[PDB]
Write a protein that holds these residues in place. Structure first.
Motif, mmCIF file in Angstrom:
data_model
loop_
_atom_site.group_PDB
_atom_site.id
_atom_site.type_symbol
_atom_site.label_atom_id
_atom_site.label_comp_id
_atom_site.label_asym_id
_atom_site.label_seq_id
_atom_site.Cartn_x
_atom_site.Cartn_y
_atom_site.Cartn_z
ATOM 1 N N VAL G 17 0.573 1.181 -13.894
ATOM 2 C CA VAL G 17 -0.765 0.772 -13.486
ATOM 3 C C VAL G 17 -0.847 0.526 -11.982
ATOM 4 N N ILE G 18 0.253 0.102 -11.360
ATOM 5 C CA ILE G 18 0.343 -0.120 -9.923
ATOM 6 C C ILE G 18 1.392 0.832 -9.360
ATOM 7 N N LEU G 19 1.089 1.394 -8.193
ATOM 8 C CA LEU G 19 1.994 2.304 -7.507
ATOM 9 C C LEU G 19 2.587 1.618 -6.282
ATOM 10 N N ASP G 20 3.672 2.194 -5.775
ATOM 11 C CA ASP G 20 4.321 1.764 -4.542
ATOM 12 C C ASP G 20 4.373 2.954 -3.586
ATOM 13 N N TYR G 24 3.016 6.694 -3.453
ATOM 14 C CA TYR G 24 1.909 7.050 -2.570
ATOM 15 C C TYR G 24 2.205 8.340 -1.818
ATOM 16 N N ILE G 55 -8.782 6.046 -9.327
ATOM 17 C CA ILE G 55 -8.752 5.569 -7.949
ATOM 18 C C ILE G 55 -8.163 6.634 -7.036
ATOM 19 N N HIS G 59 -10.137 8.329 -3.912
ATOM 20 C CA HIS G 59 -9.578 8.258 -2.565
ATOM 21 C C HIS G 59 -9.286 9.646 -2.009
ATOM 22 N N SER H 1 -8.161 0.915 -1.819
ATOM 23 C CA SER H 1 -7.002 1.776 -2.017
ATOM 24 C C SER H 1 -5.718 1.057 -1.619
ATOM 25 N N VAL H 3 -2.175 -0.924 -1.764
ATOM 26 C CA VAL H 3 -0.925 -0.725 -2.487
ATOM 27 C C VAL H 3 -0.136 -2.024 -2.417
ATOM 28 N N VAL H 4 0.235 -2.557 -3.579
ATOM 29 C CA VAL H 4 0.975 -3.809 -3.667
ATOM 30 C C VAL H 4 2.438 -3.486 -3.940
ATOM 31 N N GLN H 5 3.332 -4.218 -3.282
ATOM 32 C CA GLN H 5 4.759 -4.001 -3.460
ATOM 33 C C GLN H 5 5.249 -4.773 -4.676
ATOM 34 N N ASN H 24 0.195 -6.187 -15.495
ATOM 35 C CA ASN H 24 -0.104 -4.763 -15.623
ATOM 36 C C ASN H 24 -1.466 -4.487 -16.252
ATOM 37 N N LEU H 53 -12.382 -9.841 -10.822
ATOM 38 C CA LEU H 53 -12.162 -9.455 -12.209
ATOM 39 C C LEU H 53 -11.354 -8.165 -12.304
ATOM 40 N N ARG H 56 -5.533 -6.957 -11.121
ATOM 41 C CA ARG H 56 -4.581 -6.991 -12.218
ATOM 42 C C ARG H 56 -3.950 -8.374 -12.344
ATOM 43 N N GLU H 59 -0.728 -9.408 -10.027
ATOM 44 C CA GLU H 59 -0.853 -9.776 -8.617
ATOM 45 C C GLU H 59 -1.853 -10.919 -8.473
#
Lengths: 141, 100, 143, 63, 167, 103, 82, 145, 53
Positions: G17-20, G24, G55, G59, H1, H3-5, H24, H53, H56, H59
């Motif tokens: 669900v989340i990328l790094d 990217y 998303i 983008h 857009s 990006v979270v580590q 998640n 809302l 996720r 985070e």
RNA sequence: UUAAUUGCGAUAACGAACGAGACCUUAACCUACUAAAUAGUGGUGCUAGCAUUUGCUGGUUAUCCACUUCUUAGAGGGACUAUCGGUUUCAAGCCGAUGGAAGUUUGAGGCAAUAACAGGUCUGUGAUGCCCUUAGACGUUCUGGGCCGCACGCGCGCUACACUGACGGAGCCAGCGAGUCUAACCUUGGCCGAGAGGUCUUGGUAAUCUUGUGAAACUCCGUCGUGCUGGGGAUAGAGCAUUGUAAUUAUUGCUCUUCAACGAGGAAUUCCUAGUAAGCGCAAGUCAUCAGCUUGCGUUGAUUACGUCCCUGCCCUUUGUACACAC
């Protein structure tokens, strides 16, 4: 007296009364242009008569359609029938009969239902079933 | 004065003949009027199971009583309006009079 | 010959008018928003929390324009929908009477709508002018 | 199907038998004259009678 | 001040009520049918009967009793409803009257077959195109039987039964 | 967007490649009902092809992230090229195999 | 009683669900040379979630390497520009 | 857009109101796994806590977590309309609570035992394991084991 | 006696009954005839209700 | 040959009657007649907006005139397989093609032989014969319960198991029908409320008011993402309201919370040939309150057949029978 004719387009329950007059070449339904019936597919379905016959035949014709009854598909089909039959009636009243004949011949060649209202009327439901023919369920044991 | 006679019958033939004689009588009396406006027929329908008990295949029957309603607006003096009401009566056809 | 919300599409114009109303922010939002579900039939409140009231206002204003006069019951019926009554079949259910009534009151205060005789709320002259102006802006900007 | 019954067949036969010269091979005029030449308790029945009368005239005209 | 639908239905129920009342009271008087005419402040009820004098009564006593009974039962103003006894035309061509006569004969004790044949013969000689009489029940037995006595010819299907047939 | 030839052409090519030509009908035999190989029908070829493509698209779109439109497009591409990896062509060749066997 | 099955392992995907950054750069360099691009294509070729794919599509259309064909919701179609 | 580590800050599992909550997933629909709060309550709590809302659940900050749980514990102090709560005008004290994961079970058991002790029909049916809201037990509810 | 009929009969089958046979079952309120279905199937012709379909 | 003892015909039969058909309603067509401030149409009187070029989009009954295209109804007309081609003891007919609104007796019904069934119903009837009870009655009425109870089996069904989707917002659509008198129905609009609901009157005994029943499925954008998951919403807790004299073994609705089986279903088995199946909702019935049920209505609108007697039956003829309470 301005040249003007009054026709209709019909469907299962949709009635689209069309007033056709000598104008500046515009089409409108319920005050809205023919480009905003907004099914994005039946929109081209109602474009069908104008495109098939060519926009040159709407050089000086203004059409006003008032639509009542029936769901969206039936309303669109009634609209298209009404505008086609209105153009045909206008050409029969004022334009050459040969031109009217070729106009309606092209119309009928593309689709019979642009000028002739459908005959598929709903079959009444009868007791012993949820529909015209479907019965409920036969259970023995 | 714009009086109005409304006919609220069920027998379409008798209703039609009473309407026809009334309109022709006003025609001969030189009365301003509109034609007999014929409102949509009102059906009174009852769906009933044929059986008095609950046995047998579930068969129904629908009894429909048709009501035919007409109205004609006239403009006439009260004596001629009363004469109009008191002439041309057909049993089963019920007639009432109002104003406006 | 002339511009009108009749000659402008529905969703895009209502979105544009809602954006305009939100950007101004002079509509006197009741303050109990961000709580209700806009109906007894909806199971959730609107997804865009900070807004959706300007969207309802734009929809109501355009609906009033298109018609002559509508009322609270008409709006409840219009914005209602099929409600999932569990194992029971779906059914039409009205919208939030309070939400529709208060959007009517806000549009009245800003003058887009006015209380018309024989009950209901009709479009006002300034509302006519405004909505036609947004239609003209839409067609001058997009084209 | 289109199998006309005994009433229409017999009435058309009688009409042909006693009215051969006056009525013709055209359905339209056959019907418009039958309506006035013989009373029918039904417009649809009279149309059926006229259609079969026209068919019988066509059959007679050859052989 | 009632609706048109309820007015017509009430008129129908009223007619059914008086028809039942007359068919239960005037049975021995040959009662066969009624008709109700509506006139401003005057409802005239016509009693078709074969024994018109008997349904009228002595010096009009019975017709007065009937009129007053209907008046007070249906809560009309006295004198609004007027009852006129009329001798029915063609007593033979009236199924209600003929069934009443047959019922009367069977109450007397006349034989079932003889009474039915008499009814059939009278109906046919009175100008009827056809007659049928069905007698159902226990007729000198313990198991119910249904005898049919018919002459001429009748029909069963269509609109011609819905009008030409009197049951 | 894929296989940039005419979409109508690839659709009709899938239809004609998927029409099952040899089929089977139930025959009594006597004692144990058996099966008889029967050829012949172009209208049934067209009908069975359309139904097969649509049914395979429905199955591959059921309970999947892939949308019905794209799964139908993939099935039509596969059938038009001829791949034996599409549901409709697979069932076609299975039907012809069993007809040839019971022949 | 019985659960009308065999109770075996499924595919059990692990869509992210989340990328790094390791995702990217990969997506940014690999979204070309793609004849057909869709949310489902992104999901099944990248093992990511549908929201992340949407998303990414928005983008990527904002920047511009792929061109759109249909703007209809519930079905997004994209083609690389060469 | 953004990006979270995937650091320890972005944790796929967190402890909240004495129960485990997955990351998640959407923040509100991860709050929903707290026993005693549903979709409406989770959405309202997130909106009043001002956490996005669409963000996720993995985070969030410690302040975000603590503020959220404070709003769950004490709804009426944060302009909750007080009809959103699942314990309205309690039989014990009469004010309004909204319970958490443990207290929903606690209060359910407490009121079941209250009915059972006062010997009400509803409590006796609960004791027997039968339907209490007046359903038809003739044909349905066979899988009671 | 003030208890012999004290119970209300303002709605339902206690109040509503057939107007020809005093039946509490099969009533027809539609158009206010208050005739049970069994008797209406007999009296419908002379009431005015006829069968066409 | 036909859907048909439907006909053509054959012929110890001729002449008839019922049933079929015809018939009667309902749905299709009428720019043909009669028309209509209870329905819709056109320049404007007046007034609104972009726009004044010379338009486009709205509102107003007593401010005008003319019309029934559309709506309504009455009187009709129309289709009878019409006209051609093929086939047939070269008949009844059938099959194609062109027109036609309509060409599977145009679609659907209503009506419907003889003769029966010891089928259902004495709990519809003051419709009833015989038997039973008839005054601490089996009458009637009052107060409570029960008809709803639950280990289990069966039938008709409603909701589903999902992204051809769920949710949120936005659009705009029907048709059938009902509605208050010695008693309060359908209820617009303003206001309160999150919601269910509560308050005031004009509206309507009704093509004039509910009510354009602005219905739903459905289309446009978004959120969700193959996870029993934002699928499903059973089972339960707390509260508010409504109907009722009375709801507790929750009437019903609403708000929050609880978030179960179910991952498309074995043997078996139901209905169905075009606006039909299926999906969707609406209205009426019983209704003080209660539809997941019926009776209809309309919306969107597939697949597959144009056959056969294989299974289940039916009609006719021939045939065998030890059957006739009739396999």
């Amino acid at each position: 007296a301005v040249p003007s004719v009054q026709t209709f387009g019909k469907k299962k329950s949709a009635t689209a009364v069309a007033h056709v007059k000598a104008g500046k070449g515009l089409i409108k339904v319920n005050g809205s242009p023919i480009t905003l019936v907004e099914p994005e597919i039946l929109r081209f379905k109602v474009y069908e008569p104008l495109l098939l016959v060519g926009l040159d035949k709407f050089s000086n014709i203004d059409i006003r359609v008032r639509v009542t009854g029936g769901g969206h598909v039936s309303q669109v089909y009634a609209i298209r029938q009404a505008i086609a039959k209105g153009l045909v009636a206008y050409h029969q009243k004022y334009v050459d009969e040969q031109s009217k004949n070729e106009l309606k011949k092209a119309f009928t060649s593309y689709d019979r239902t642009l000028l002739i209202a459908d005959s598929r009327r709903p079959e009444p439901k009868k007791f012993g079933g949820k529909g015209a023919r479907s019965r409920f369920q036969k259970s023995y044991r | 004065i714009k009086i109005r006679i409304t006919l609220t019958s069920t027998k379409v033939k008798q209703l039609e003949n009473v309407s026809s004689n009334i309109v022709k009588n006003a025609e001969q009396h030189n009365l301003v009027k509109k034609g007999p406006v014929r409102l949509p027929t009102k059906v009174l329908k009852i769906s009933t199971r044929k059986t008095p008990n609950g046995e047998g295949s579930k068969t129904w029957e629908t009894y429909e009583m048709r009501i035919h309603k007409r109205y004609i607006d006239l403009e006439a003096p009260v004596q001629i309006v009363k004469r109009i009401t008191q002439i041309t009566i057909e049993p089963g056809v019920d007639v009432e009079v109002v104003v406006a | 010959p002339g511009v009108s919300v009749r000659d402008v599409a529905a969703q895009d114009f209502i979105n544009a008018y809602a954006s305009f109303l939100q950007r101004q922010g002079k509509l006197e939002v009741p303050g109990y928003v961000d709580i209700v579900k806009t109906s007894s039939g909806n199971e959730m409140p609107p997804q865009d929390a900070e807004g959706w009231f300007y969207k309802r206002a734009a929809s109501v204003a355009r609906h009033i324009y298109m018609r002559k006069q509508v009322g609270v019951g008409k709006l409840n019926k219009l914005y209602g929908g099929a409600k999932s009554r569990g194992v029971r079949p779906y059914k039409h259910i009205d919208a939030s009477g309070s939400i529709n009534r208060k959007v009517l009151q806000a549009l009245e205060k800003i003058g887009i709508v006015e209380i018309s005789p024989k009950g209901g709320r009709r479009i006002s002259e300034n509302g006519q002018r405004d909505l036609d102006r947004i239609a003209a802006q839409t067609l001058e900007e997009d084209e | 199907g289109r199998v006309r019954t005994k009433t229409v067949k017999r009435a058309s036969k009688a009409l042909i038998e006693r009215y051969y010269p006056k009525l013709t091979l055209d359905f339209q005029t056959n019907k418009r004259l039958c309506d006035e030449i013989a009373t029918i308790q039904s417009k649809r029945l009279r149309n059926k009678i006229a259609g079969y009368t026209t068919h019988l005239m066509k059959r007679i005209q050859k052989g | 001040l009632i609706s048109k639908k309820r007015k017509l239905v009430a008129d129908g129920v009223f007619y059914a009520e008086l028809n039942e009342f007359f068919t239960r009271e005037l049975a021995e008087e040959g009662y066969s049918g009624v008709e109700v005419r509506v006139t401003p402040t005057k409802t005239e009820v016509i009693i078709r009967a074969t024994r018109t004098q008997d349904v009228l009564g002595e010096n009009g006593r019975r017709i007065n009793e009937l009129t007053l009974l209907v008046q007070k039962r249906f809560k009309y103003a006295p004198g609004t409803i007027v009852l006129y006894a009329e001798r029915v035309q063609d007593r033979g061509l009236s199924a209600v009257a003929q069934a009443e006569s047959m019922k009367f004969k069977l109450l007397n004790g006349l034989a079932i077959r003889r009474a039915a044949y008499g009814v059939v013969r009278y109906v046919m000689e009175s100008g009827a195109k056809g007659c049928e009489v069905v007698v159902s029940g226990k007729l000198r037995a313990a198991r119910a039987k249904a005898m049919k006595f018919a002459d001429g010819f009748l029909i069963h299907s269509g609109q011609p039964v819905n009008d030409f047939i009197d049951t | 967007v894929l296989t940039d030839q005419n979409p109508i052409q690839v659709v009709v090519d899938a239809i004609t490649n998927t029409g099952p030509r040899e089929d089977t009908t139930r025959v009594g035999g006597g004692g144990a009902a058996r099966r008889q190989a029967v050829d012949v029908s172009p209208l049934r070829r067209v009908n069975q092809a359309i139904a097969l493509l649509t049914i395979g698209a429905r199955e591959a779109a059921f309970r999947n992230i892939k949308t019905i439109a794209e799964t139908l497009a993939e099935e039509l591409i596969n059938a038009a090229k001829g791949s034996s990896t599409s549901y409709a062509i697979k069932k076609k060749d299975e039907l012809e195999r069993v007809a040839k066997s019971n022949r | 009683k019985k659960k009308w099955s065999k109770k075996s392992m499924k595919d059990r995907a692990q869509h992210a669900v989340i990328l790094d950054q390791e995702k990217y750069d990969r997506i940014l360099k690999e979204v070309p040379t793609y004849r057909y691009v869709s949310v489902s294509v992104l999901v099944d070729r990248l093992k990511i979630g549908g929201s992340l794919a949407r998303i990414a599509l928005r983008h990527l259309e904002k920047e511009g390497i792929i061109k759109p064909i249909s703007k209809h919701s519930k079905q997004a179609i994209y083609t690389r520009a060469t | 857009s953004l990006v979270v580590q995937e650091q320890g800050s972005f944790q796929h599992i967190l402890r909240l109101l004495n129960t485990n909550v997955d990351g998640n997933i959407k923040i509100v629909y991860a709050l929903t796994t707290i026993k005693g709060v549903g979709r409406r309550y989770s959405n309202l709590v997130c909106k009043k806590a001002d956490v996005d809302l669409h963000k996720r659940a993995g985070e969030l900050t410690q302040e975000e977590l603590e503020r959220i749980v404070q709003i769950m514990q004490n709804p009426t102090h944060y302009k909750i309309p007080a009809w959103f709560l699942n314990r309205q005008n309690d039989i014990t004290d009469g004010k309004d609570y909204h319970t958490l994961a443990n207290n929903v079970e606690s209060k359910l058991r407490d009121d079941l035992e209250r009915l059972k002790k006062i010997r009400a029909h509803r409590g006796i049916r609960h004791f027997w394991g039968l339907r209490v809201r007046g359903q038809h037990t003739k044909t349905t509810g066979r899988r009671r084991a | 006696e003030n208890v012999w009929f004290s119970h209300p009969r303002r709605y339902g089958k206690g109040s509503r009954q057939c107007r020809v046979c005093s039946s509490h079952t099969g009533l027809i309120r539609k158009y206010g005839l208050n005739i049970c279905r069994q008797c209406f199937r007999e009296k419908a012709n002379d009431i005015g209700f006829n069968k066409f379909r």
